[PDB]
């Protein structure tokens, strides 16, 4: 549906919709401006977030979250939560006694902005650390790369 | 146990007395202590009863309404002396302050004046 599917009204707090639309301007359609920011560190803001209509206060690009700290990647595992997904990170732990490695994993729940519409299970996502968004969410999805696909039969 | 104003019951009760209530001085800042106090109504079971005369009668009580004791020492602030002595302004304010005389046997007589503030 539209962006008003709840008990409150969503809007980007930096945007004033009611900019005195009088006869000097044709009403309508005066398309409301969209707040968007470059998150830095070389990441490119997606075109969907530039011109989309969704509201997400936790979005890295159209929300009030700043990426700072560690940048790291993972593999999407589940997508059965609202605006947030869990990713699995595989690494090897070294054991000195046996001079061999040990395969370990840690699941991380990360916030997935609606700008990344084209996200399946198994994709590679780069996440950046932000302020705690939920009880167990501290990373926000910055870039989505397909998993040897981009073509579907 | 001292009697406290406003308790409003004959007998003894325990109160969490904070700073500057009554019947308690704190040993440190913010300290509150639970103490036993006596109610404000009097009865037979009281050791003493502090009473204050508010007006005079027909004659003098022996040993009470006679040999009036002076205030130990006079005013100090430069305005509390003006109110007591009707000083207007710069009427030799320093000299009008009360000068207390000191008289000890093992010493010469001498009078002592206090430092006046403001």
């Amino acid at each position: 549906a539209d962006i008003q599917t709840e008990r409150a009204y969503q809007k980007q707090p930096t945007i004033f919709q009611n900019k005195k639309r009088v006869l000097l301007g044709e009403t309508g359609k005066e398309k409301l401006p969209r707040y968007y920011k470059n998150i830095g560190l070389g990441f490119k803001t997606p075109k969907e977030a530039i011109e989309g209509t969704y509201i997400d206060k936790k979005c890295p690009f159209t929300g009030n979250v700043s990426i700072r700290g560690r940048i790291l990647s993972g593999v999407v595992t589940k997508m059965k939560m609202q605006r947030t997904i869990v990713i699995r990170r595989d690494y090897l732990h070294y054991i000195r006694k046996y001079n061999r490695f040990e395969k370990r994993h840690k699941n991380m729940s990360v916030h997935l902005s609606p700008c990344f519409r084209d996200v399946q299970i198994g994709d590679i996502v780069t996440v950046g650390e932000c302020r705690p968004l939920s009880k167990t969410v501290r990373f926000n999805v910055l870039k989505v790369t397909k998993a040897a696909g981009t073509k579907k039969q | 146990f001292p009697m406290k104003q406003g308790v409003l019951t004959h007998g003894r009760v325990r109160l969490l007395l904070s700073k500057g209530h009554s019947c308690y001085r704190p040993r440190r800042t913010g300290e509150r202590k639970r103490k036993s106090v006596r109610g404000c109504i009097v009865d037979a079971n009281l050791s003493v009863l502090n009473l204050v005369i508010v007006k005079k009668g027909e004659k003098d009580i022996p040993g009470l309404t006679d040999t009036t004791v002076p205030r130990r020492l006079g005013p100090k602030r430069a305005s509390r002396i003006r109110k007591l002595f009707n000083l207007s302004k710069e009427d030799d304010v320093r000299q009008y302050v009360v000068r207390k005389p000191l008289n000890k046997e093992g010493k010469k007589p001498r009078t002592k004046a206090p430092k006046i503030q403001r």
Binding site: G40, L41, G42, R68, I71 | -
Partner: protein, 262 residues
């Protein structure tokens, strides 16, 4: 703990204070001041273990009370005042002036300086910002802040500051090929010239510095402190000229010095 710590164990004291293990259990524990306690010298050690003027803690207490110690143009009675880096310790009764600069081994050394070269001081601007009514402010590596600076001074530059006035006499721009001094880490106390400033967004910048002998070393941007215009240092460098020498050559330097003195 339930509040601020006001003790410093002798073992836990910074190494460059060069304190021993047997005199006592505690350390000066410097008071709060313009410099962090890890890279500051309390006045107590400076007048007891550096110059040996005082023997014990109460002896350095008497000298500070008599008010001849004058740090950065101001008399300081604090026994544990944090001196810091390139601060002028002027004792006028004895006529000696000290500029507190690290030696070659990353330790503060006694640097006697001339009286007229004590009237100024170098400083590293750390944050630049504009205050109310549009007044630009400037805070240095010390806790000293000034208003109305020259708009060409940016962050991590050097400002030529004269004492008793607090104004900016001149300034040194941060640029490639400028003489600097490292103020922290392994390369602490090494005099050299900027060769390259690589930058890392979101992280600390790394700069590459080459000394007079040609040795090239790197460090973080927060440990850089430019003290010269290109090649010429603006302060009297301490003995050793801020040059780092490996274990091989101070040994033969002792043998040569011993043989000459023998």
């Amino acid at each position: 703990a339930r509040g601020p710590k006001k003790h410093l164990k002798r073992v836990a004291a910074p190494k460059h204070w060069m304190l021993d293990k047997l005199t006592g259990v505690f350390a000066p524990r410097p008071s709060t001041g313009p410099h962090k306690l890890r890279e500051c010298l309390p006045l107590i050690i400076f007048l007891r273990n550096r110059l040996k003027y005082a023997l014990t803690g109460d002896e350095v207490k008497k000298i500070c009370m008599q008010r001849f110690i004058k740090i950065d143009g101001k008399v300081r009675t604090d026994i544990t005042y944090p001196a810091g880096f390139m601060d002028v310790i002027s004792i006028d009764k004895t006529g000696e002036n000290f500029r507190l600069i690290y030696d070659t081994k990353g330790r503060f050394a006694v640097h006697r300086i001339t009286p007229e070269e004590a009237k100024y001081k170098l400083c590293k601007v750390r944050k630049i910002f504009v205050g109310t009514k549009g007044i630009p402010h400037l805070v240095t590596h010390d806790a000293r802040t000034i208003r109305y600076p020259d708009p060409l001074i940016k962050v991590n530059d050097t400002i030529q500051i004269d004492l008793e006035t607090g104004k900016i006499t001149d300034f040194i721009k941060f640029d490639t090929g400028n003489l600097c001094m490292v103020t922290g880490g392994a390369n602490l106390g090494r005099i050299g010239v900027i060769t390259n400033r690589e930058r890392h967004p979101g992280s600390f910048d790394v700069v590459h510095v080459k000394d007079a002998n040609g040795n090239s070393f790197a460090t973080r941007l927060s440990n850089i402190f430019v003290i010269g215009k290109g090649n010429k240092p603006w302060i009297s460098l301490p003995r050793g000229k801020g040059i780092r020498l490996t274990i091989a050559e101070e040994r033969d330097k002792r043998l040569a010095a011993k043989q000459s003195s023998g």
